Each structure stands twice: as structure tokens, then as C-alpha cells.
Ligand SMILES: *Cc1c(COP(=O)(O)O)cnc(C)c1O
């Protein structure tokens with residue numbers, strides 16, 4: 001019947017827009033700098049070698065497809081917490097942590113979000129940085145929480161507005177919830193330094209806030225997995241009990257397999273067992289049990305010395321390629337005879353880059369060079385390759401000189 | 402910190418409670434009739450043959466791990482809609498339907514539930530049969546819907562309470578939501594007959610109710626995929642635009658891979674396009690995109706004539722196995738000299754069977770014969786084997802004589 005007559009067509013996605021437009025375009029010189037996934041030097045999706053190995057191993061075993069437990073694969077969840085906290089870490093050693101398998105980063109974030117909605121009696125506000133990953137808004141909003149914001153990115157220098165963020169944090173009502181990106185901020189690429197994180201911790205500790213870490217790029221950011229979780233660790237060390245979402249989408253390139261986790265740092269193991277129980281009660285009516293393929297794969301790798309050694313080599317290779325590209329892009333702009341400062345492009349970490357380009361410059365980049373990106377000036381370094389970085393440098397100079 | 406000091410231990414689950422207990426038992430003759438997943442004549446998990454074929458094909462192809470669209474894998478949703486509606490189905494040829502991939506049946510039901518909450522303006526009430534799958538309550542409840550019920554199962558005869566149901570349904574306020582199991586009712590095993598379905602459909606049309614079909618056993622119930630979907634079809638042919646949830650967990654044995662779909666029948670292809678945009682919007686903030694493994698396999702099977710042909714043979718194979726055990730259970734009861742009426746056991750369809758045993762009888766079975774089942778009298782037919790059906794019939798005789 002006419003049950004759905006009142007349902008309107010939802011707005012379009014800009015990003016998707018960017019991609020379709022890239023598709024039509026008949027310039028063979030076209031570049032898609034909108035891509036939100038890694039790409040190798042040949043502009044192709046990259047399936048890691050340790051992943052193909054883990055896969056063949058699973059195959060070789062004729063494993064069943066039986067339902068996994070609500071909280072996920074135990075070998076997987078433990079390994080995840082281990083990867084985040086560190087092996088000789090107090091939180092880990094004493095087991096006061098609770099880790100659940102989620103549907104990649106997103107579902108992990110979502111589950112935590114609904115956890116807070118249900119049990120965090122202290123507040124309803126979630127502080128997100130300006131700007132933050134697009135999906136962050138509706139996630140917390142649909143879970144039924146309210147959104148607020150703290151200054152983070154600085155448009156004048158395309159770096160961190162330390163002054164502005166401290167000021168804002170110093171003013172957040174005690175017991176509020178603050179969301180922090182562990183590394184490789186998305187979408188700017190701007191991450192605080194160590195001294196700056198020390199400061200941020202003190203104050204977060206001070207005003208007694210609940211820190212919610214979104215760790216979607218451990219290993220993939222600097223190529224060092226310890227280095228990448230420094231901020232998260234420092235926070236716990238300082239006695240701050242965080243909450244965290246992990247995703248294996250990028251670091252292991254497990255994109256569509258959906259492997260991730262959500263962890264809660266509790267006072268002790270007792271309480272952790274309590275928290276785990278409510279987490280299961282919350283998860284069951286959402287999807288019952290999580291998808292097994294991706295967890296099995298990540299598990300084998302973290303838990304099998306030979307594959308893990310190899311994994312570390314590969315992730316480092318991915319970060320190295322991106323870093324090189326950033327590197328090459330600046331050096332080519334100097335070579336084109338650009339007189340503007342482009343250090344931010346190398347100061348920035350991870351897959352995304354806030355170029356600082358204005359909307360009119362971006363329109364021109366599109367129309368004249370067939371370089372497709374979002375109007376915010378953001379670029380996905382993954383779309384850059386040895387074979388096109390020159391051209392790209394060339395076009396930037398041209399729309400900016 | 403003490404953030405979670407007020408979070409209490411969640412209450413223990415009973416099903417989990419019986420297998421746990423079943424595990425600790427030393428009786429060599431013990432049986433687990435609490436299992437919610439198919440088992441072979443050997444009490445082992447069964448990864449279908451076609452499934453194994455599908456996986457190596459997938460492996461030979463060297464496919465990537467790139468994200469799937471938010472709505473899922475196109476060949477999987479198309480294929481999935483075809484199987485339910487039927488190939489020369491008006492509704493299917495006309496394109497007036499919308500199918501989205503979910504995280505198995507549970508995930509699909511949840512997405513459905515959440516869509517109803519958002520856009521079904523006519524009512525927040527959801528009518529569940531008495532009884533229904535345990536997970537159905539929290540599903541609708543966490544979504545934000547109110548729960549109601551209708552009579553369905555006659556405890557006096559262990560069959561359908563057709564009168565109580567019709568009476569009850571007649572009375573449901575127009576435009577309310579009614580949840581229906583397509584076939585193989587869980588947990589009773591009680592399904593209406595074709596004639597009773599026409600009658601139910603005629604009242605459902607009348608009252609202008611929104612029917613929500615939960616289809617988690619197509620092909621798995623009778624062993625015939627058309628027959629198992631007759632009711633869903635009849636309602637549509639009756640001009641009833643339903644909503645549906647599908648699961649590939651049992652019919653394909655995809656359990657832990659989590660493959661399923663949610664479908665909405667709309668007035669026309671134009672209206673569907675609109676309903677599809679709102680589902681994507683609701684989905685992104687839940688888990689971004691679905692898990693690829695299960696869908697890949699399932700699509701390949703549905704899509705390759707040669708594997709579909711084998712799948713059919715295999716699923717008949719499974720339903721046949723369950724029919725046989727019910728038949729055997731009955732006949733062995735007769736021959737032990739049991740005088741109770743056990744016809745319900747054969748009249749019932751599916752992997753679950755409401756035996757009519759009383760808690761005190763169930764208790765004897767456990768302590769004395771090591772037969773583990775739930776106190777409500779529900780037995781999972783998958784846990785019965787050609788080599789224990791004999792032991793089962795005798796024990797039931799001893800506890801009921
Ligand atoms: C990629 C990303 C995630 C998680 O993505 P998934 O594919 O769901 O694992 C979470 N947060 C940020 C900031 C991301 O960039």
C-alpha cells in the first residue's frame with residue numbers, strides 16, 4: 001500500500017559525487033584523490049602477502065563456519081588489546097580491560113556509542129574536534145548522544161591550534177566525553193607532538209573527562225606500531241581510563257572483511273567482567289554475532305610470529321610509500337618554482353592531506369587537470385603515485401601561483 | 402575514575418547454560434539437544450560441498466578486499482530478492498522492491514526495526530506471536546518499538562491456535578505492525594497450513610496491517626525452496642506489501658560469515674529508489690558497510706547454474722535428515738509402548754520441536770540420561786542422530802510413561 005509515500009530521497013554524498021565524476025571524465029590523465037583506501041604504486045588495490053598466506057592457511061585447515069561467540073574470537077580480541085596497550089603494559093598484564101570484536105572500526109565506534117548512551121550516567125555530551133571524520137556525527141547522534149566541539153585544526157598554518165584546543169578543553173564541564181584521534185587525524189593529517197599530548201593528558205586528567213580514542217591507523221601512520229599508540233598509552237599511564245575503537249581495515253588492508261574492536265579500560269578485572277556482560281546484552285540484538293572471516297585472518301597474523309614479522313614489514317612499506325609521496329610532492333613544487341610554504345604537507349601524517357587549497361582552486365584543479373578531490377581542499381595521498389606526482393605538483397603550482 | 406562502578410553483572414543466558422552444562426557431563430551417552438545449528442548424522446558441523454567449491458573459486462580468482470557498497474554486493478542482493486519473491490514474480494520483474502544486505506538475519510531484522518522506527522508513522526506497536534524467538538523482543542525494543550502479542554501456539558495440543566490467532570489478529574488496530582515467521586516457526590516448529598494462510602492473509606489485508614516476514618529457513622524447512630516461500634508470495638499476490646528479513650545461516654550453513662538481507666516491497670520502482678536512499682543513511686552510522694565473505698559465497702552459488710543445482714540437492718539433503726529423525730523418533734516411541742499422542746512431532750516443521758514435555762520431565766532426562774535441553778520442552782532436532790534416536794525415544798518413554 002501507500003506505506004512509504006512520505007519518504008523523501010536522501011541527500012547525495014559529496015565524496016561519492018567526487019568519484020562518479022572521476023569515472024565519467026575522459027581525460028586519461030585523470031586522478032582520483034578522493035579514494036579513502038590505500039593504493040599501490042600502480043593505482044591498484046593492495047592485498048597484503050601475509051593476508052593471502054593466512055588465508056591459504058585457513059583454507060588448508062577446513063575450518064568450520066560455526067557461529068562465533070557474541071564478543072568475538074577470543075584469540076582475536078586478546079591480540080587486539082595486546083597490540084594497542086603493549087605486552088608489558090600494566091592494563092594488559094592485570095586484565096582490567098574488556099575487548100569486544102566489532103564490525104570494523106565503525107561498528108566498534110557505534111557499539112561504544114550505544115554503551116555510553118546506556119551507562120554513562122555522567123553526561124550526554126561528546127566533544128569532537130573541528131573538523132572530524134564525517135561519520136562521527138551521525139554515529140553518536142543516532143546512538144542518542146549530543147554533539148559539541150573543540151578547536152583543533154588551524155587554517156592559517158594548516159597545523160594544530162594547540163592554543164585554541166587547550167583553551168577549549170580547559171573549559172569542558174567535568175565528566176564530559178571527549179573524542180580523540182590516536183594518530184593520523186582524519187581528515188586533516190594534523191597530529192599533536194609528544195610534548196603537546198603530555199599537556200593534553202594533564203588537562204584531560206584534571207577536568208576528569210572520559211577519553212574516547214579512535215584508533216584507525218596503528219602502524220599505518222608512521223610505520224611503527226608502538227610509536228603510533230604512544231598517545232593512547234601515555235593516557236592510561238597517567239591514570240586516565242580510556243575507551244577505544246580499533247580498525248584493521250587499513251593496517252592489514254582488511255577493508256570489506258570488517259575486522260575491528262572496542263575496548264573499555266576498567267578499575268580491575270572484576271568490573272571488566274561486569275562491563276563485558278552488558279556489552280554482550282547490547283550486541284546480541286544488534287547483529288547476534290560478528291563476521292568470522294576478517295578476525296580469523298587478523299588473528300593468525302598477530303598470533304603467528306612468522307606472519308607478524310612479515311606484516312610489520314608490509315605495513316611499514318605502505319606508510320613508507322605514502323611518506324615518500326608527501327616528500328616528492330613538496331620537492332616537486334619547489335622545483336616548479338612555487339614560493340609558498342608547503343611544509344604542512346610533510347608535517348602531516350597518514351593517508352589524508354589538508355592542502356589548504358581554496359574552493360575555487362579545487363574547482364580549477366578539477367576542470368583543467370581532471371584531478372578530483374573534495375572542496376575542503378582534502379587529498380587522499382593514496383591516490384598519488386610515482387608516475388603522477390609530477391603532474392599533480394604541476395597542477396597545484398598552476399592553480400596557486 | 403570509577404566510571405563503571407555502577408554497572409551490574411548482566412543475567413546469565415539459559416541456552417548457553419545448557420551447552421555449558423552439557424560440556425561438563427561425563428556421560429558417554431549424553432546428548433545436546435540445545436544446539437542451534439545443524440549437525441550431521443555424526444553430530445558434526447556441515448560445511449556444504451557447494452560452499453567449499455564456491456570458496457576455492459573465490460580463491461582462484463584472487464579477488465581484492467575493497468569495501469562493498471553500503472547496501473552490499475549487488476549480485477547478492479538481486480539474487481537474494483529473486484529467491485524470495487520468485488523469478489516471474491510481478492513484484493520482482495517490476496522492480497518495485499528494495500533489498501539491502503544485512504549482517505545475517507539478526508542484522509537485517511535490526512535494520513528493518515530501525516527503519517520502521519524512523520519512517521513508519523502510523524504506529525510503534527509490533528505484534529509478536531506467542532511464543533517467538535527470544536531475540537525478537539530486545540531487537541524491536543532496542544530499536545524503540547513497543548511490543549504486543551497474538552495467540553499462536555496451542556499448548557493443549559502442541560499445534561496452531563488458529564482460533565485464538567484470528568480472533569486476536571482481527572482486533573489489532575489497523576496499520577499496526579505484525580511479525581510473521583515464513584515457515585519453520587522458531588521455537589515451536591508449528592506452521593499454518595496453506596488454507597490457514599489464505600485466511601490469515603485475508604484478515605491481514607482487511608485490517609491494513611503491515612506484515613513483516615522473518616524468513617530464516619527457506620529450503621531448509623520442507624527441502625523445497627518454492628514451498629517454503631509460498632506464504633510470503635501469497636501475501637504479495639494478495640496485494641499485501643510486506644517487509645522481509647532473510648538469512649543464509651542455515652540453508653547455506655554460512656553461520657559465522659553472516660550473510661543476509663532486508664527487503665521492502667514498495668508501490669513502484671520510483672518509490673523503492675527513495676526507500677533505498679534512507680536505508681543507506683541509516684546503515685552507514687551503524688557499521689558503514691557489510692562483511693564481504695558470506696555474500697561472495699552465497700552470490701556465487703545462486704548465480705552459477707551448476708552450484709545452485711548442487712545447493713538444492715544439499716539442502717534437501719539437510720531437511721530430509723531432520724524429517725527422518727522426527728519420523729524415527731515417533732516410530733520408536735510407538736514401539737516402546739508409548740501411548741501418548743506424539744503426532745505433533747511429525748506435524749511440526751523445522752529444526753526445533755516443542756515436545757510438550759514438562760520441566761520436571763526435562764529435569765529427569767538431564768540427570769538420568771544426560772539429555773540436555775531447555776526447560777520449556779524445546780528440542781533441537783539437529784542434535785538427534787540415527788544412532789541415538791533409539792536412546793532418545795526410550796528415555797522419553799521412561800520419563801513420560
Ligand atoms: C577508517 C576510519 C575508521 C574505521 O573505518 P572502518 O572501515 O569501519 O574500519 C574510523 N575512524 C576514522 C577516523 C577512520 O578514518
Ligand SMILES: *Cc1c(COP(=O)(O)O)cnc(C)c1O
Nearest residue numbers: 288505506507534587617648650
Ligand atoms: C536463525 C534465526 C534468525 C537469524 O539468525 P542469524 O544467525 O542472525 O542469521 C532470525 N530469526 C529466527 C526466528 C531464526 O531462527
